[PDB]
Amino acid sequence: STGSATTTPIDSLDDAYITPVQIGTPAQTLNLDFDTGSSDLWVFSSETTASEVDGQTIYTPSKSTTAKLLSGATWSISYGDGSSSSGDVYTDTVSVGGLTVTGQAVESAKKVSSSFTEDSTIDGLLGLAFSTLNTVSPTQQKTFFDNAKASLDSPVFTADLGYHAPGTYNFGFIDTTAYTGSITYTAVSTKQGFWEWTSTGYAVGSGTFKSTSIDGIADTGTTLLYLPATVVSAYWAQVSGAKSSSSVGGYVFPCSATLPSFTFGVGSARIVIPGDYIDFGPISTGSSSCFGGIQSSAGIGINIFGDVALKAAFVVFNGATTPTLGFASK
């Protein structure tokens, strides 16, 4: 089997992407944030505290004839951005772009943190990291991909995120029309439950390539590119007027400035992030100060190849017995 679904930016800055997901019988369609940096499929629901729901579409398990309580199961998650959610668990039928999993754990939120409430466009998350990170207790649950894997034509999914435009998540096949050149595959460590890999270096604009190992995660659920402070400083030093603002919480730059591209290494191959992808607009409405899309990972504890990086490539998440990651230009 295979599946193919369009993913759509939530706003004009590509702050996140939402993909429609069918849950239950008859189908309830929710727009979920596909997150290769986590491993829970959780949704706003009829059980979510009413004051914490503000425009989201909810899953109502009582209206699904295939929903079954996962008795005794609870879940609770906190994300790198400080947001969180928790609740109980049902199993139900979940379909993405034509691909159907029966008995998928659907984690129903009883509580969500303010950032989730305040974002009306995201109805939940669909985790695509390794199932070892799943928070369901007492019995850890499998991700949608893990459940589908054995049935897929090939045990892979791909992320093809658009710049200020829709893109595509495919399951079970590689669309050879969706990228240019070849796909370069690189080793993955699953030791932290992430799609963790090592970039071979970077360049800033037309500058020479610096060969240096950068361990980080391929994370579709993180908006920006977070790299070591040395790398980030080298980038922003090439932008007139850029500075790190402690009050704002990262590098900002005048929108009159021209942003250089940023290249990262995948083996001997190179992915070029165009300068425009690194502009995240005014820090506040009407401000001449713009927020940068490359920021320091110092104090996160890990480097994150988030959407800024991933949307510059066609990315293969290869879930073979020894997982690997593939990157192609497009």
Curated annotation (Swiss-Prot):
- Cystine pairs annotated here are 255-290
GO BP terms, alphabetized: proteolysis
What GO molecular function terms would the record report?
aspartic-type endopeptidase activity
What's its EC?
Answer: 3.4.23.22
Catalytic residues of the enzyme:
35, 199
Query: Does the keyword Ion transport feature in the UniProt annotation?
Result: no
User: How is this protein named in the record?
Assistant: Endothiapepsin
Q: Which gene encodes it?
A: EAPA
Q: Which residues of the full protein are shown?
A: 90 to 419 of 419
